[PDB]
Design a protein around this motif. Structure first.
Motif, PDB file in Angstrom:
ATOM      1  N   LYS D 377      15.248 -10.540  83.980  1.00  0.00           N
ATOM      2  CA  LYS D 377      16.623 -11.394  84.352  1.00  0.00           C
ATOM      3  C   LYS D 377      17.999 -11.165  83.507  1.00  0.00           C
ATOM      4  N   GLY D 378      18.417 -12.017  84.270  1.00  0.00           N
ATOM      5  CA  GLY D 378      19.937 -11.797  84.162  1.00  0.00           C
ATOM      6  C   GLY D 378      20.405 -10.633  83.582  1.00  0.00           C
ATOM      7  N   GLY D 379      20.052  -9.268  84.229  1.00  0.00           N
ATOM      8  CA  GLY D 379      20.351  -8.315  83.922  1.00  0.00           C
ATOM      9  C   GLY D 379      19.907  -7.547  83.236  1.00  0.00           C
ATOM     10  N   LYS D 380      18.987  -7.839  82.304  1.00  0.00           N
ATOM     11  CA  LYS D 380      18.087  -7.487  80.947  1.00  0.00           C
ATOM     12  C   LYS D 380      16.946  -7.558  81.493  1.00  0.00           C
ATOM     13  N   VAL D 381      16.095  -6.521  80.782  1.00  0.00           N
ATOM     14  CA  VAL D 381      14.559  -6.655  81.182  1.00  0.00           C
ATOM     15  C   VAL D 381      14.674  -6.113  79.822  1.00  0.00           C
ATOM     16  N   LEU D 382      13.584  -7.227  79.572  1.00  0.00           N
ATOM     17  CA  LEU D 382      11.880  -7.708  78.214  1.00  0.00           C
ATOM     18  C   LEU D 382      11.392  -6.374  78.432  1.00  0.00           C
ATOM     19  N   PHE D 383      10.689  -5.444  77.962  1.00  0.00           N
ATOM     20  CA  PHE D 383       9.693  -4.925  77.527  1.00  0.00           C
ATOM     21  C   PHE D 383       8.927  -5.581  76.951  1.00  0.00           C
ATOM     22  N   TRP D 384       7.798  -4.434  76.542  1.00  0.00           N
ATOM     23  CA  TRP D 384       6.798  -4.910  75.830  1.00  0.00           C
ATOM     24  C   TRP D 384       5.703  -4.367  75.472  1.00  0.00           C
ATOM     25  N   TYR D 385       4.828  -3.612  74.516  1.00  0.00           N
ATOM     26  CA  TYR D 385       3.514  -2.832  74.372  1.00  0.00           C
ATOM     27  C   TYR D 385       2.400  -2.903  73.817  1.00  0.00           C
ATOM     28  N   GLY D 386       1.889  -3.076  73.686  1.00  0.00           N
ATOM     29  CA  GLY D 386       0.278  -3.428  73.375  1.00  0.00           C
ATOM     30  C   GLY D 386      -0.309  -5.219  72.806  1.00  0.00           C
ATOM     31  N   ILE D 387       0.462  -6.180  73.851  1.00  0.00           N
ATOM     32  CA  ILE D 387       0.044  -7.274  73.861  1.00  0.00           C
ATOM     33  C   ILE D 387      -0.305  -7.893  74.504  1.00  0.00           C
ATOM     34  N   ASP D 388      -1.608  -7.666  75.029  1.00  0.00           N
ATOM     35  CA  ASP D 388      -2.685  -7.788  76.774  1.00  0.00           C
ATOM     36  C   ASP D 388      -3.557  -9.652  75.867  1.00  0.00           C
ATOM     37  N   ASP D 389      -2.803  -9.964  75.795  1.00  0.00           N
ATOM     38  CA  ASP D 389      -3.291 -12.018  75.768  1.00  0.00           C
ATOM     39  C   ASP D 389      -1.828 -12.654  76.412  1.00  0.00           C
ATOM     40  N   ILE D 390      -3.414 -12.694  77.379  1.00  0.00           N
ATOM     41  CA  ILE D 390      -2.524 -13.437  78.596  1.00  0.00           C
ATOM     42  C   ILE D 390      -0.873 -14.734  78.185  1.00  0.00           C
TER      43      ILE D 390
END
Ligand SMILES: CC(=O)N[C@@H](CCC(=O)O)C(=O)O
Lengths: 405, 436, 436, 405
Positions: D377-390
Motif C-alpha cells: 500500500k502507498g508504495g510501501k510493502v509490509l512484510f512479516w514472519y512467524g505470525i500465522d494467527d489469522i
C-alpha cells in the motif's frame, strides 16, 4: 528464420563500414540475415557520364536496352563491394546476382526492361545459409528465357519476406524512423491491430506514409504474429533489432487474447486438452483433464487465451474474490511476456482476484510483483490483488489455510 | 591436414613427380594457377571424384578457376518435355523455351558442385553470370546462342582473394542482359587467354591421346619440336588434328610456363602436377637445333655455361675450356634447345658414335627435353654408345634408353642398337682400357 | 597446409620412401607410430629444432610418444647447491636431496617442451607421473633409483585419443607413491615393449654411425646378417660396440616389425620414414635359411604357394607343379625367410650360376628383404647371372645390383662379378641362343 | 583470475554430464575455472570391496602405505574420466595430477601418508590456461623427496584460493548446501565472525563438515572481507557464478554483530549518528537523527551493529510483532550481504517480526523470500514472519494502512 534486410544503394556507397560491421555482428552472434540491395544514386551518375538522360514514369525507371547495361554493371559492383567488405571483417558472404527472382515484363512499352516478380527460388539462399555464408542478393529478376529485368528493391524484399517468413524485416533508409508530423514525436512503435485505423485518419500522415504503412500491413497480415517490420537508419540498427524502442519505427500486428465463457467457444476442444496437460497437477497429478473439463462445462467462468493456446488463464467466478483457477503457459509464453499480457487483461476485467502458486515455482517472484498481498503456508503462497478490505482478507486467508486438508 | 598428405602421396611414384609437385608449390610467382573445364557429364557421374580432387588443390593452397557445361542433362529434359534437341553446325539452336531448360540445368548442376565442395570444407562461390559478355553469334540461325566478346575478371578475382573456389557456368550475356548460350570449350579458352594460368585442364571421357600405330599413350607433346611431324602422321585422325591445332593456337598466346592437359576425370590429381600422369600434356617447349661447329652457336659463352653442369667438368679433370678446344677440330653433331637448357654432342669418329657430352639442367629433366633429345638422337644415330656416372641422379633413365650396360670404375657404359655380340666386346674393352 | 606438404616433399627421393610414408599414414598409426627418447641436453640446447620437428609429425597426423630425460641440467643444479653428482655402474646414486633436484628439473624441462610445442599449435599433454611403476633397484647402493615393474597405458592412450602428443618424464613410482629415478634409455625400452611401435628413435647429438675407415655414413644394419662382422671391425670403437649391442638386446625382445633409429635432431623428420636418412637405422632383419633340396622345406605346400606369385607361373606356361619336378633332380641352393615372403633359387650348373627364381611379395619389396637376400647371394656367389622381364616392376633395382646388362627379346640379362671381357661374350651368347 | 571449483568425487561418478557440460559452457564463453577434484566414495567403495574399514580421525583419512595405492589409482581414474568427458564436448582439458602442491607430513604416526601443504606452484595451472586448456587438478601433494601425500580435497581447494585470489570459490556438494542436521533447515548464509563457534559446537555437525568449515575460515581470514565461498549443488552452478544470490550455503567472514539495548552501550554516540545519517528519510528527510536518537533513549529497543557501524538494525519491541524500525546499511554492506547476516541474527532473537520496504527497493524480491506474508500500500510493502494467527495479521495490516497519514 531470422531477418530479411533491404538495403538502399545509397548506403553501400556512403556507409559501407557502418553497414558491414553491423551485419558482421549478426554473423558473429550466429544470426544469418538475408540481405537484398538496390543501386539508385550510383546509376544516375553513370548514365549522365555516358550522356543518357535518366528516365522515369510513375516513380519507375524506364530501363531501356542501354540503360540496363549500366544498371547491371552497378548492381554487380555494389554487390561485390558489400561482399568484399564483409569478408574483410571475417564474414562469409556469397553474392547471388541472379537465379532467385523470376519475372514477366511489368509493361514492355511503358517501362521496357522492368520486371514484375512472378516467383522466388529459395535454393540458392538456403544453400548459402546452410554453407555458413550470408547471402547478398541483388534485386534483379529474370524471365524464363533469361532476359534480366530491373525490379523494385522494396517489392523484392517483400517477396522474400513472404517466402521466408523471417522474424524481422528491416528497411534501411537514410531518413531514420517515422516522425509524428504534428508533435515531432519519433514514432518508435505501431501495433496495427489497435492503432492502424486512427493513424491513417490523421491530418499529418502524408500520402507517402499512408502507402508505406499500408503495404506493411498487407505484408504482416499473413506472416506470423512474431514477425515485425523496422524502418531504421543504418547506425541504430544493432539497437532496433533487439530493443523495442531503438531510434527507429517498429511496426507489427500486435497480439491477440480471446475471452471465452464456455468450452463451446473454443475452436478445438482437443487444442484445449493439449494446452491443459502442461499443468503441474495434471501432467501426472491426480485430476485428469477429462474430468476437469467436466467441471468447467457446469461452472461460471471466464477464460483468456491466445490463438495458439500457448497461455490459457481461467478465472472461476464463484466466491467473491474470484479465483484464477488455471494459468497454464508454456515457456515460450513466459519468455515473450504473454503472461504479462494475460495478467493485464485480467487486472482490467477482474478488479479483485486471488490465486495460489507453489512456494518454489520457477517465477514466484513475478507473481509477487503482480500481487498486493501474499500469505505462505504449507509450501503454497496465496496471492491476491485489489481487495484492501481488511476483513475479506481474513476470509480469504482462512479459507486458504482451511484447504491444506 | 593428414587428409591431404595421404591423397598427395597416393598419386606419386617417381621422384620426377615429386620434383614437379615441389615446383608448383614453390611457384613464388603469383601467376594464376589453373582453369579447369569440366564437362557436364562429370558433375552427374563423378561428383565425388571431381569434388575431392578440387578439394585437394584447395587444401594445398591452389585456387583453380572451374568452368562447367551441362550437355547430357539438358537433352534428357528436352526429351522429357517432348522438344527435339536441335543443332546446326555443331551448335545448339537455343530458342526461347530451350534457353529456359538450359538455364535451369546450368544453375542446378552448378549448386550441385558448390554444395558438394562445401560439404568437404572447401569455400565455393557460384558465379552464374557477370563474367562473359557476348554478341549474338547469329540471331536467326542459332537464336539465343552467343559469341564471347569479353571476360570480366573482378568476380573471379574477388572470389579467389576471399579464399573461395570460383565455379563458373559457361553462359554469357549481352550488354542489355539477355543470357546467351555459349560453348564451354571456347569459354575455357577465353578465360585462359585473360588469366594466363599455368595449367589449362580439359576433362574429357576419352582420356589422353594414344599413338594409333604403337598404342603408346602419348603423355607429352612439345609443340615447337614435335607439332609438324605429328600432324603429318598416318594414324592421327581429324578430330585429334583439330584439338591439337586449337591447343597450339592457345599456347602461342600464353607464356612458355603454361600448358594444357587432356585427361580423364580420375587421373586428374595426378596429371595436374606429375608430368607423365595418364593423359596427354601439351606445351610449347622450344625447338632443338642441330649444329656441326662452334661457329653455328650464337653464344660460345652460352655453350660453356651449359657444359659446366657436367659431373666430370664442374670440378672433374677435363676443363670445359680444353674440351671446347678439341671440339673446334672435330667431326661432331650437336643438339640443343634455344636456352641451352639441354645440350648433346655426338662425336662421329669410331663406328658406334659416342654421345660425348649430354648435359641437361633439372629444368630440362622435368620437361622431358631429355626425351626430346634422345628421340632425335635415336633417329639420326641408329647405334650409339655413351657413359654416365655410376650415381647420376637419373641413371635409371639412361638404363631404360639403353639395350646394354657395363659398369666399371664408377662409370656405366651404355649403348643401343648394336646387338652384334662381337662389336660389344670391342666396345666394352675400349671403355675398360680407358681407366688408365 | 602448403607449409607441411612442402616440407614433406623436400624429404622424399625414391618411391620406396613414398611407399613407406604411405604405410605410416595408413599404418597401425597413431599409438603405435613411434617412441622418441629425447636426451635432456636437447631440450636445453635445441628446443626449437626439436619442437618444430615434432610439430611436423603432429601436422601430418602422426603421434609420437615422447619420453625425455634431464641429465645436464640436474648436475649443474646439484653443483649450484653444493652437492656432488654421484654414480656407480652408470646409475645415478639418487639420495633424498638429489631426488628433489631431479624432480624439479624433470617437471621444468617437461613444461618447457610442452609450452614450446603449444606455441607452434601442437596439443601437448605433460605426463609427469602415473605411467611407470617400479621397485627399488637396490635401496642401499642407489637409494631412490627404480626398476620398472610395469607400464600403465591409459594416460598415453587417452592423450593420443584426445589429439595431444604425450610428453613423458622417465620417472617411476612405487605403488605406495615414492618417486624413483629411472634411466631414460631403459624407460624408452619399457614403453616400446608395451606399445610395440614401428620406430624407436634415440635422439642424440652425435648423429648416426660413420664407418671410421671410409667415412660412409652407415645408414642401415640388419643385425641377423651383419652383426657379427661389424663388431669384428678395426674401426668400430668401444662406445659403438656397446650401443649396437644394447640395441640388439632390445630388438631381440620386440617384433621383427620394429626398428631403432639413432639420429641427430635435425634429420629426424627424414629418418622416421625414409630408410636412408642421415642416421643409422638398425633392425633385426631376417633369418634367411639356405636349403638344397625340396626335402628340407618344412612345407612343400608353402613352397608352392610362394612360387605361384611369379609372372610366368601365376598363369604362365610353366606350372609350379612341373617346375618343382625339375628342381628335385637339380644342383641348387635356395634361400628363404621363415614366412617364404622371399624365395631365391640359384641353379649351380654352368659356371656363372643362375638365380633361376626370385619370388618376393610386395610386402618383401617394401621392407627391403630383397636387399637382404641379395646381400647373402653376393657373399655366397661372387659371380651370378639372372634374367628379369624388360618391364618388371622394379627392373631399376636389378640394374642397381648388377655390373652389366644386355637386353634382347623383352628380357634383360644381368650379371655381377664377372668383369672378364671374354666370359661376358659367353654369357650373352648363351642368353641370346635361348630365345629360340 | 576467475574461479576455483572444488568438485566432490561423488559428482564425477553420478553427474559427469551435468558437470562437464556446465564447465564446457564457461569454457565456451571464454572463462577458465581451475577445477580441483577429490575421490571420496570411489575409494571407500574399493576399501570395502577389499574388506578394509575406511579409516579416519579428525575428518582426515588415515592413509597407510596400501591405502595410498588405492587413493592414487582412484585419483588418476576419476581425473581422466573428467578430462575425457570435457574433451568429448570440445573443451581442451589438461590433467594435472602432480607438481602443484608440495607438502610435509601432517602427522606421520596419526595419519601416516597424509600431507600438509607447504606451498602451491602456479606455473602448471597458468601454462594450461595460457595454452587454452581447463586445468583439472587432483588434490594430491608431494614431499621434496617425492613421496606423494594424500591431502583433503577441501583443503587443497583453499590452498589454491589463497594463492590465486579468484573472484569465485565454489564448493560443489550433493546436499545443495549445508543442511542443519537437527531441523533440515537449509542454512543459506554463515557469517563466521558471529556464528562459527556455536556452529562447531553442534551435535549434528559431522566431522567432515567441521573440517570443511574450518578450512574455509582459515581461507577467508587471509582474504578480503569482500570474498566468500558458495557450497552449491551442481545444477545451480551456472547460476551462482554470475548471480549474487544463487542457492546453496554461502559462507563469509562477516562481522560480529553486537547487541545493544541503550544509547549508553554504544562506544561512540557520534559514530551512531554518522551511521544513521545515510538513511533515505534522514540524509535530508523530515526527521533529524538528532531527534530520532532522542526518541530511542526513551524506548524499549534492541540494536544490532557490527564494530564499524557499516550496518545498524534497530528493533522496537513494543507492539506484539516487534518492528524492525531502522536498518541503515552502507552500499558496501548490501553487496556483501550484511543484510543476510543481520536477518539471520534477527530471526533467531525474534521469532515474529514485521518490517516495511519501499515498493521499488532494489532487492524487494529478497525481502519477499525472507517473509511469510506481504501487503502492498502507498508504495510501501509490509512484510512479516512467524505470525500465522489469522487475527493478529489483520491488526498488523490495519495499523500499517492507518499510517499512510
Ligand atoms: C586427503 C585425505 O586425507 N583424504 C581424502 C582426500 C580425497 C577427497 O577429498 O575426496 C581421501 O578420501 O583420501
Amino acid at each position: 528464420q531470422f531477418a530479411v534486410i533491404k538495403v538502399g544503394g545509397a548506403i553501400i556507397s556512403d556507409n559501407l563500414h557502418e553497414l558491414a560491421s553491423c551485419l558482421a555482428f549478426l554473423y558473429h552472434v550466429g544470426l544469418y540475415p538475408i540481405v537484398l540491395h538496390g543501386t539508385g544514386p550510383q546509376v544516375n551518375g553513370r548514365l549522365e557520364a555516358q550522356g543518357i538522360e535518366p528516365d522515369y514514369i510513375d516513380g519507375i525507371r524506364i530501363t531501356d536496352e542501354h540503360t540496363m547495361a549500366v544498371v547491371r554493371k552497378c548492381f554487380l559492383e555494389q554487390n561485390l563491394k558489400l561482399v568484399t567488405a564483409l569478408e574483410q571483417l571475417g564474414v562469409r558472404a556469397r553474392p547471388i546476382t541472379s537465379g532467385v527472382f523470376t519475372a514477366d515484363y511489368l509493361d514492355k512499352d511503358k517501362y521496357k526492361l522492368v520486371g514484375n516478380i512472378k516467383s522466388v527460388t529459395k535454393e540458392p539462399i538456403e544453400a548459402s545459409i546452410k554453407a555458413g555464408a550470408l547471402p547478398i542478393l541483388t534485386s534483379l529478376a529474370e524471365t524464363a528465357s533469361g532476359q534480366m529485368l530491373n525490379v523494385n528493391a522494396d517489392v523484392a524484399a517483400g517477396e522474400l519476406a513472404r517466402v521466408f517468413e523471417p522474424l524481422k524485416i528491416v528497411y534501411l533508409n537514410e531518413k531514420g524512423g517515422i516522425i509524428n508530423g504534428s508533435t515531432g514525436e519519433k514514432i518508435s512503435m505501431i501495433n496495427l491491430d489497435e492503432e492502424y485505423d486512427d493513424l491513417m485518419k490523421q491530418s499529418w500522415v502524408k500520402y507517402g506514409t499512408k502507402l508505406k504503412i499500408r503495404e506493411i500491413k498487407e505484408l504482416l497480415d499473413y506472416l506470423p504474429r512474431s514477425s515485425s517490420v523496422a524502418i531504421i537508419n543504418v547506425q541504430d540498427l544493432q539497437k532496433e533489432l533487439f530493443t523495442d524502442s531503438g531510434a527507429g519505427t517498429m511496426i507489427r500486428r500486435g497480439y491477440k487474447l480471446v475471452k471465452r465463457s464456455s468450452i463451446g467457444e473454443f475452436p478445438s476442444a482437443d487444442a484445449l486438452r493439449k494446452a491443459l496437460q502442461r499443468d503441474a497437477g495434471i501432467s501426472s497429478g491426480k485430476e485428469s483433464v477429462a474430468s476437469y473439463l467436466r467441471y468447467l462445462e457446469n461452472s461460471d467462468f471466464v477464460s483468456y487465451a491466445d490463438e495458439p493456446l500457448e497461455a490459457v488463464a481461467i478465472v472461476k467466478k464463484d466466491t467473491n474474490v474470484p479465483t484464477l483457477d488455471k494459468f497454464v503457459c508454456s515457456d515460450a509464453a513466459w519468455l515473450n511476456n504473454v503472461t504479462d499480457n494475460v495478467f493485464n487483461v485480467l487486472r482490467r476485467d477482474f478488479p479483485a482476484l486471488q490465486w495460489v502458486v507453489s512456494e518454489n515455482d520457477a517465477n514466484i517472484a513475478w507473481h509477487f510483483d503482480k500481487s498486493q498481498g501474499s500469505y505462505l503456508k504449507g509450501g503454497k503462497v496465496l496471492f491476491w490483488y485489489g481487495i484492501d478490505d481488511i476483513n475479506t482478507i481474513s476470509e480469504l486467508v482462512e479459507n486458504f489455510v482451511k484447504s491444506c486438508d
